[PDB]
Design a protein around this ligand. Sequence first.
Ligand SMILES: [Ca+2]
Lengths: 223, 41
Amino acid sequence: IVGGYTCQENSVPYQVSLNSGYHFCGGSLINDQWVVSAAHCYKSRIQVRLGEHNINVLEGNEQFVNAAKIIKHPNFDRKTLNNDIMLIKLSSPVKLNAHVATVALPSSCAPAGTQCLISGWGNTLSSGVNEPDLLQCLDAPLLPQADCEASYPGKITDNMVCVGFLEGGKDSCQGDSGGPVVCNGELQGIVSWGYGCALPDNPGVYTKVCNYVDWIQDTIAAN
Amino acid sequence: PYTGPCKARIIRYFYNLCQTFVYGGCRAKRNNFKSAEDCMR
Ligand SMILES: [Ca+2]
């Protein structure tokens, strides 16, 4: 996250870190046994870390659970990133508490202009590299689809939504992928891609979660 | 090294000598290896 601020200790309880030796992607806890992330964050072996704030220090509130099932959307395109969404079933249910909680799936697609909260442990620099210890937060609005398309000519599908500022300055970055974009208590987006981080005319592109609620529920009930 | 448009944080190798860089997770170029040995070959 570039241009953000450190999130208040356990104010983002649904945020998880995907780890395979080191943190490589984020995710969101949607129920006591399922995590939702981006399909491009796929790995054959993944350990999910919940209750994290400082990913580099053992604080005492974290839960470490291995992924038992990793299911990517059947229509995921690694080239265009269309349908960049994936579900992870945990080895065992997690213990829900003040530091570890679930986030609600969308009731409907949020309109442009809606204010959202993006979070992650990704790069904080547009130029250079600075990996934070602490979880970063960023308040940003959902952009009109026309501005999204104008920023990325012919690269935006109906399953993508732009979030951020057309002037740059604030944006998600490498290490944020798979993370949450929550608007009014509902998960409306998943950090997916963008050209660089926080560059003008190139705001972040996110997977439109509201287009996958039924697929998500159907998959969870079948697995 | 080409990080790519995706925002994952995956460590990959690239030739300078063979060194590391953060790969985004998608649309990798040729100068992107999973190991140093394969990179030096
Ligand atoms: Ca920690």
